[model samples]
Target: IPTGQHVVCRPWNPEITLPQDAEMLFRDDKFIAYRLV
Candidate 1:
């Protein structure tokens, strides 16, 4: 899951607060969002 430049945002609940040099590439329920090139 490394195509563009820098992307990583795995948030499947747990308060839910991302954005700010996001760096969490792993979760359970299933959650993956990235957009940075």
Candidate 2:
């Protein structure tokens, strides 16, 4: 099972979403959260 959480936040943006298999925010191919597996 894939799981994720917010590692950081910016007041500039909301309504943020993530990929199905991803574990967290990936802005510009950068992972904001660590992998669960």
Candidate 3:
């Protein structure tokens, strides 16, 4: 996906604050993550 593409992220619980419609930064899987737009 693009660096600024919009995506949904489901981590663990739905009640928790997570990324639903946020901006994607990079795909590192080790450290990097997404950003809010």
Candidate 4:
């Protein structure tokens, strides 16, 4: 179980789609989202 919505949008990872659009929107690595839990 988790609080809120926790997801990993790895555009860098070829395995995952660059931008799912509905899921996430990634443009550049300069700005990225992270978590410390």
Quick one: best TM-score, which candidate?
Answer: 3
* Candidate no. 1 TM-score: 0.26
Clashing pairs in 3: none
Cα lDDT, all candidates: 0.60, 0.40, 0.51, 0.41
Off by over 4 Å in 1: 1-4, 13-29
Q: Determine which window of 10 residues in candidate 4 has minimal summed lDDT.
A: 13-22
Per-model TM-score versus the true fold: 0.26, 0.23, 0.33, 0.23
Question: Per-residue lDDT for 1-37 in model 3, tens only?
Answer: 5486544444434244545666555545344455665
Kindly list the per-residue Cα lDDT of model 4 for residues 1-22, writing each as its tens digit. 1586454533354344334333
The CA lDDT at 23 in model 3 is 54
Consecutive 10-residue window with the lowest summed lDDT within model 2? 28-37
Candidate 4's displacement at residue 14, Å, is: 5.4
The order by descending TM-score is: 3, 1, 4, 2
Error of 3 at 13 (Å): 15
User: What TM-score quantifies how close candidate 4 is to the native fold?
Assistant: 0.23
- How many pairs of residues collide in each model? 0, 0, 0, 0
* Residues 16-37, model 1: lDDT tens digits: 6766656555565766565444
What lDDT score is found at residue 31 in candidate 4?
A: 44
Q: In candidate 4, which residue ranges exceed 4 Å CA deviation?
A: 1-3, 9-11, 18-22, 29-37
Candidate 3, 6: how far from true, in Å?
A: 14
Best model number under lDDT: 1
Full candidate order by lDDT, most accurate first? 1, 3, 4, 2
